[PDB]
Amino acid sequence: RNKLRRQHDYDT
Amino acid sequence: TRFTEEYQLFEELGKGAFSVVRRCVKVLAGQEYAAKIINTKKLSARDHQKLEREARICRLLKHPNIVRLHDSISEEGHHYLIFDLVTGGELFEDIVAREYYSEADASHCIQQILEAVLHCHQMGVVHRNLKPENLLLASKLKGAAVKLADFGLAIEVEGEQQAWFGFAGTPGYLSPEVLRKDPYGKPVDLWACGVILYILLVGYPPFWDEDQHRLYKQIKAGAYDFPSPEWDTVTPEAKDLINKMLTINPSKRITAAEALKHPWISH
Numbered sequence: 001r002n003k004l005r006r007q008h009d010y011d012t
Numbered sequence: 013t014r015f016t017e018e019y020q021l022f023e024e025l026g027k028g029a030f031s032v033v034r035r036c037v038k039v040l041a042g043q044e045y046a047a048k049i050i051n052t053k054k055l056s057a058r059d060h061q062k063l064e065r066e067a068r069i070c071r072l073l074k075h076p077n078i079v080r081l082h083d084s085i086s087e088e089g090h091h092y093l094i095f096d097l098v099t100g101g102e103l104f105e106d107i108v109a110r111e112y113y114s115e116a117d118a119s120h121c122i123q124q125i126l127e128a129v130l131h132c133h134q135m136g137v138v139h140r141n142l143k144p145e146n147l148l149l150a151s152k153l154k155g156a157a158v159k160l161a162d163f164g165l166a167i168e169v170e171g172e173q174q175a176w177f178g179f180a181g182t183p184g185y186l187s188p189e190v191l192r193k194d195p196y197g198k199p200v201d202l203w204a205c206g207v208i209l210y211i212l213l214v215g216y217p218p219f220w221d222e223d224q225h226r227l228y229k230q231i232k233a234g235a236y237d238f239p240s241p242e243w244d245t246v247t248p249e250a251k252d253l254i255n256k257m258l259t260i261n262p263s264k265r266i267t268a269a270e271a272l273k274h275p276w277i278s279h
Contacts, residue, residue: 001214001216001239002216002217002218002219002220003216003220004107004108004211004215004216004217006104006145007143007145007182007183007184007185008182009141009164009165009180009181009182010179010180010181010182010183011058011062011165011180012178012179012180
């Protein structure tokens with residue numbers, strides 16, 4: 001299955 | 013100025029890149045709060061802009077399921093944001109620890125997020141960065157309220173008008189319309205609810221590739237699934253709500269109003 005991970009925000 | 017004269021700092025609660033958050037007390041009130049203390053010296057241009065926005069937008073919103081900003085002070089090298097005290101940590105950390113949620117809890121949780129989202133949309137605010145990291149549990153208690161946090165990327169909108177507000181958010185939770193570079197609005201937050209709800213039930217996300225440009229195709233094509241056997245004991249009304257949230261066309265996607273009236277939540 002796809003793993004759940006902490007992900008960071010894009011702001012550009 | 014008036015942070016020193018009105019408030020008293022206590023223990024470290026969390027550290028940032030250019031911010032610390034410390035428990036504090038408005039002294040003549042004897043009410044405790046979470047003081048995010050930000051080194052304004054260290055901040056860049058766009059960082060400053062987001063801070064002003066975050067302070068004005070938070071202050072528009074007053075809902076039990078939204079982390080309330082009570083005050084905003086500035087002191088040459090430090091800005092103090094006086095928030096709700098919140099001791100239960102992130103919904104992310106609580107999902108890992110518990111791995112997945114029963115349909116009952118999943119319903120009770122997504123319920124609170126949707127109400128908070130409804131308030132935002134009713135106040136002409138779109139969060140854009142809805143994810144379990146930015147959803148916080150009130151306390152360590154086993155029925156503690158969920159509060160929406162981090163409006164640093166939040167925007168103001170005029171009624172139901174869509175516009176290109178820029179590429180912003182977290183790859184896993186980005187709406188198809190954002191990725192297509194189409195004008196967007198309230199529906200993006202309801203896409204993010206779909207991905208969060210999906211994670212609550214089975215404990216893993218519906219969109220992931222190690223290759224980001226493939227991930228973005230997976231989102232744009234609506235290419236998610238309900239793999240056997242884990243999803244075979246999940247109810248069709250749970251899947252139904254999710255399918256309505258993970259609609260490719262914002263125009264056809266269920267709103268916060270409509271989702272709160274969904275049988276899976278309603279009953």
